[PDB]
Design a protein around this ligand. Sequence first.
Ligand SMILES: O=C(O)COc1ccc(Cl)cc1Cl
Length: 412
Amino acid sequence: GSVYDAWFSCASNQVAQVLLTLPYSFSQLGMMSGILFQLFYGLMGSWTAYLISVLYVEYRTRKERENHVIQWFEVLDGLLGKHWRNLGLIFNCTFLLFGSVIQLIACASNIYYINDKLDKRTWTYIFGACCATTVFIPSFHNYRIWSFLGLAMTTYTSWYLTIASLLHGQAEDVKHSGPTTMVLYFTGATNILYTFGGHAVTVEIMHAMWKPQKFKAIYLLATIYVLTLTLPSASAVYWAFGDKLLTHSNALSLLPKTGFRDTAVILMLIHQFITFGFASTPLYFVWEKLIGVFKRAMARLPVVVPIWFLAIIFPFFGPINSAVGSLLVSFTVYIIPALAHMLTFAPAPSRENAVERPPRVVGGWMGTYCINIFVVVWVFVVGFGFGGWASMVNFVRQIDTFGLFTKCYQCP
Ligand SMILES: O=C(O)COc1ccc(Cl)cc1Cl
């Protein structure tokens, strides 16, 4: 519950499986573009985390003026009308569902690389069956105390990727094509957008804190550490391997098979299972609320059926990240929080009586509003329009190439 616990939670939650697909995005963007996009989207994610923190603090203070777990849709209801609550709930639930699908696909892809006898689709079957047991757990929340473990797995995997890439060097056939076409560039930009943001579960972690008013610096440090992890691994992998990453979205596929790779795969699988549980628990909560409900185990069974069907039908490890990042994340973690922050404080009485004043360095309310407008416009233009179009055209291209219900997606 202390500051360190919150930092560990919000640093381990930042990247779970996208760490492997980042070099794939670099294969489309390049070095300079990739690094710039990573830094810019890390700053944007930190800013949106601060916006969510101030919104949650205002809502909690207003509620206290006149236990349970405070969720994002509840905060939106408290600070605005019911239509805002409906929009936030729908977008958050859809994003969490697709994120759970992504984490299951990543688990199947990772497990495929330590036991190649079984294709990736059978691994998806078995991992869906195994993760169906997540319904039994009452709530994966309040168990986040073991987040330092996941942070250790993430940092070890990143440093292993960096070291292995540096040791492997470059072959004579390595060619850094760079930004070949706009579609791939925007798909990579959308993937980097997805990599950061907090994933609409920032409020859940922030609730545990004794004093949530200091979440801004904690999230800033967590995201700067996550950047320090992401930049070297992706940079090394790209510089070493080059355009060959397009045909292999998963970084571990290209690296030589060794004990270190097996340990990294196992640790990433454990981390992805934990992250899937964390992301699916809110869906179970919402389903329980809607349906009116150890009987909960069978009530939550229909919740995992959509996840299982989406993983098998669309096992694309790379393109799915961009699709979710453009269609859902761009509105769930980047636009909705900013719009809510702008609207709640738009009235003068609300702005004057704000519980926490805007940061002095930014420039007060004017600077905060300007940054919110910039965030909204940028995420809507590059994160949704161009990013969404590029991601979806890439997705349909992959559907046409590998087919539907593809077996061992990218299994050369
Ligand atoms: O892989 C990633 O980049 C992030 O994955 C997630 C992690 C935690 C939660 Cl709650 C939701 C998602 Cl999509």
